[PDB]
Amino acid sequence: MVLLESEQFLTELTRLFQKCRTSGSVYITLKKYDGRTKPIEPADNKCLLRATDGKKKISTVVSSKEVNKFQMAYSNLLRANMDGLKKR
RNA sequence: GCCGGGCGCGGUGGCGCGCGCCUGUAGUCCCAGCUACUCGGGAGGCUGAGGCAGGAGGAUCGCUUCGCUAUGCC
């Protein structure tokens, strides 16, 4: 798939959230990433996040050296783009 | 040989396909065409892949529920 870095991944996730506003759903999947590139070397410090809407899909890999920078930005992006609920 | 799958709607005689919904792998991009006919063509990555039968777990399709008694010639 379209594998991008965190900087472009967040921007494209923003576009997905905006495009799935009036019609469409946003699918976000998080899973521990081993690092394999060939069918069954195995790394234990990677995580994989895939964002799709049915038509366009993007994927990203976050490691230890970038977890600290990516966590806050991802949480802020979710807070900004996941509005539209009841406030009780 | 493999590189998503399924549900409903729609088009086509048919394939490819468009829309909405749900759900995966470490593992896809582009161009719209093939012309009575079961995946049209191009460019990339992989060695294991395909089919059958059971089991638990998601969104959905079809069914549903007249007696008692009280103050008293104090």
Tab-separated table of N, CA, C and O (backbone and C1' of nucleotides) in Angstrom, chain A residues 1-2 24-25 27 31 33 36-40 50 55 57, chain B residues 4 19-29 46-48:
chain	number	residue	atom	x	y	z
A	1	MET	N	0.824	-1.201	0.000
A	1	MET	CA	0.000	0.000	0.000
A	1	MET	C	0.858	1.250	0.000
A	1	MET	O	2.077	1.178	-0.136
A	2	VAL	N	0.202	2.401	0.137
A	2	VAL	CA	0.888	3.689	0.173
A	2	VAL	C	1.470	3.848	1.574
A	2	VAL	O	0.770	4.236	2.512
A	24	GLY	N	-19.675	8.407	4.600
A	24	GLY	CA	-18.444	7.646	4.665
A	24	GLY	C	-17.966	7.436	6.087
A	24	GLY	O	-18.306	8.213	6.984
A	25	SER	N	-17.183	6.383	6.305
A	25	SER	CA	-16.655	6.051	7.619
A	25	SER	C	-15.134	5.995	7.569
A	25	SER	O	-14.538	5.765	6.513
A	27	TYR	N	-11.797	4.147	9.010
A	27	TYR	CA	-11.265	2.939	9.626
A	27	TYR	C	-9.813	3.174	10.018
A	27	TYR	O	-8.983	3.508	9.165
A	31	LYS	N	-1.710	-2.170	15.151
A	31	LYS	CA	-1.269	-3.525	15.445
A	31	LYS	C	0.242	-3.535	15.615
A	31	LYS	O	0.956	-2.769	14.966
A	33	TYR	N	3.854	-4.355	14.937
A	33	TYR	CA	4.487	-4.591	13.646
A	33	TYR	C	5.807	-5.316	13.864
A	33	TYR	O	6.704	-4.793	14.533
A	36	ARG	N	8.335	-7.745	9.062
A	36	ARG	CA	8.511	-8.655	7.940
A	36	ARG	C	8.206	-7.957	6.621
A	36	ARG	O	7.332	-7.089	6.543
A	37	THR	N	8.944	-8.339	5.579
A	37	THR	CA	8.693	-7.872	4.224
A	37	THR	C	8.521	-9.013	3.232
A	37	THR	O	8.307	-8.753	2.042
A	38	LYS	N	8.610	-10.257	3.681
A	38	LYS	CA	8.505	-11.430	2.830
A	38	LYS	C	7.661	-12.476	3.543
A	38	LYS	O	7.572	-12.472	4.776
A	39	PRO	N	7.023	-13.375	2.795
A	39	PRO	CA	6.184	-14.403	3.423
A	39	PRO	C	6.996	-15.343	4.303
A	39	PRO	O	8.184	-15.591	4.090
A	40	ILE	N	6.322	-15.870	5.321
A	40	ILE	CA	6.933	-16.813	6.248
A	40	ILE	C	6.999	-18.201	5.623
A	40	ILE	O	6.159	-18.562	4.798
A	50	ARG	N	-2.809	1.689	10.125
A	50	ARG	CA	-3.399	1.796	8.799
A	50	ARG	C	-4.701	2.580	8.875
A	50	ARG	O	-5.552	2.311	9.728
A	55	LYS	N	-11.936	3.425	-0.148
A	55	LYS	CA	-11.337	3.711	-1.447
A	55	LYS	C	-9.831	3.927	-1.367
A	55	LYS	O	-9.073	3.271	-2.086
A	57	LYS	N	-6.293	4.097	1.012
A	57	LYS	CA	-5.717	3.560	2.235
A	57	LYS	C	-4.269	4.012	2.359
A	57	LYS	O	-3.551	4.114	1.360
B	4	G	P	-4.456	-6.617	-3.957
B	4	G	O5'	-5.893	-6.367	-3.321
B	4	G	C5'	-7.009	-7.154	-3.706
B	4	G	C4'	-7.324	-8.197	-2.666
B	4	G	C3'	-8.790	-8.578	-2.526
B	4	G	O3'	-9.214	-9.517	-3.498
B	4	G	C1'	-7.877	-8.172	-0.389
B	19	C	P	-17.203	4.911	-6.475
B	19	C	O5'	-18.601	4.916	-5.710
B	19	C	C5'	-19.525	5.980	-5.888
B	19	C	C4'	-20.839	5.691	-5.206
B	19	C	C3'	-20.755	5.258	-3.752
B	19	C	O3'	-20.561	6.340	-2.858
B	19	C	C1'	-22.241	3.835	-4.910
B	20	G	P	-19.625	6.157	-1.565
B	20	G	O5'	-20.569	5.423	-0.512
B	20	G	C5'	-21.752	6.049	-0.037
B	20	G	C4'	-22.646	5.071	0.683
B	20	G	C3'	-21.990	4.242	1.776
B	20	G	O3'	-21.861	4.942	3.001
B	20	G	C1'	-23.293	2.836	0.397
B	21	C	P	-20.652	4.602	4.003
B	21	C	O5'	-20.976	3.129	4.517
B	21	C	C5'	-22.120	2.872	5.317
B	21	C	C4'	-22.208	1.419	5.707
B	21	C	C3'	-20.957	0.821	6.327
B	21	C	O3'	-20.816	1.137	7.699
B	21	C	C1'	-21.805	-0.652	4.687
B	22	C	P	-19.356	1.212	8.361
B	22	C	O5'	-18.941	-0.314	8.556
B	22	C	C5'	-19.758	-1.196	9.309
B	22	C	C4'	-19.386	-2.640	9.076
B	22	C	C3'	-17.933	-3.009	9.321
B	22	C	O3'	-17.645	-3.192	10.696
B	22	C	C1'	-18.689	-4.001	7.303
B	23	U	P	-16.169	-2.908	11.266
B	23	U	O5'	-15.292	-4.103	10.684
B	23	U	C5'	-15.568	-5.449	11.039
B	23	U	C4'	-14.813	-6.418	10.165
B	23	U	C3'	-13.309	-6.221	10.099
B	23	U	O3'	-12.630	-6.756	11.222
B	23	U	C1'	-14.155	-6.539	7.918
B	24	G	P	-11.093	-6.376	11.485
B	24	G	O5'	-10.292	-7.338	10.501
B	24	G	C5'	-8.940	-7.077	10.163
B	24	G	C4'	-8.403	-8.113	9.208
B	24	G	C3'	-6.928	-7.996	8.866
B	24	G	O3'	-6.093	-8.555	9.863
B	24	G	C1'	-8.176	-8.324	6.885
B	25	U	P	-4.656	-7.909	10.172
B	25	U	O5'	-3.716	-8.529	9.047
B	25	U	C5'	-3.641	-9.933	8.857
B	25	U	C4'	-2.740	-10.281	7.701
B	25	U	C3'	-1.419	-9.531	7.652
B	25	U	O3'	-0.438	-10.087	8.510
B	25	U	C1'	-2.429	-9.489	5.515
B	26	A	P	0.387	-9.138	9.510
B	26	A	O5'	0.940	-7.984	8.563
B	26	A	C5'	1.906	-7.054	9.027
B	26	A	C4'	2.974	-6.823	7.989
B	26	A	C3'	2.482	-6.716	6.554
B	26	A	O3'	1.995	-5.425	6.234
B	26	A	C1'	4.312	-8.204	6.647
B	27	G	P	0.656	-5.261	5.360
B	27	G	O5'	1.064	-5.820	3.925
B	27	G	C5'	2.077	-5.182	3.161
B	27	G	C4'	2.354	-5.920	1.876
B	27	G	C3'	1.137	-6.334	1.068
B	27	G	O3'	0.583	-5.276	0.313
B	27	G	C1'	2.621	-8.153	1.214
B	28	U	P	-1.010	-5.103	0.240
B	28	U	O5'	-1.229	-4.199	-1.050
B	28	U	C5'	-0.784	-4.646	-2.326
B	28	U	C4'	-0.110	-3.543	-3.102
B	28	U	C3'	-1.003	-2.347	-3.434
B	28	U	O3'	-0.217	-1.153	-3.421
B	28	U	C1'	-0.200	-3.308	-5.431
B	29	C	P	-0.914	0.292	-3.548
B	29	C	O5'	-0.906	0.565	-5.117
B	29	C	C5'	-1.627	1.647	-5.688
B	29	C	C4'	-0.968	2.119	-6.960
B	29	C	C3'	-1.897	2.543	-8.086
B	29	C	O3'	-2.406	3.857	-7.931
B	29	C	C1'	-0.232	1.111	-8.947
B	46	C	P	10.801	-9.210	-4.744
B	46	C	O5'	9.811	-10.318	-4.171
B	46	C	C5'	9.408	-10.303	-2.810
B	46	C	C4'	8.422	-11.404	-2.512
B	46	C	C3'	8.835	-12.802	-2.945
B	46	C	O3'	9.697	-13.418	-2.004
B	46	C	C1'	6.576	-12.388	-3.564
B	47	U	P	10.636	-14.650	-2.430
B	47	U	O5'	9.700	-15.928	-2.256
B	47	U	C5'	9.076	-16.215	-1.008
B	47	U	C4'	8.110	-17.369	-1.117
B	47	U	C3'	8.752	-18.741	-1.303
B	47	U	O3'	7.944	-19.731	-0.667
B	47	U	C1'	7.370	-18.261	-3.159
B	48	G	P	7.919	-19.851	0.937
B	48	G	O5'	6.698	-18.925	1.375
B	48	G	C5'	5.371	-19.433	1.430
B	48	G	C4'	4.708	-19.396	0.076
B	48	G	C3'	3.214	-19.681	0.057
B	48	G	O3'	2.432	-18.545	0.386
B	48	G	C1'	4.278	-20.963	-1.615
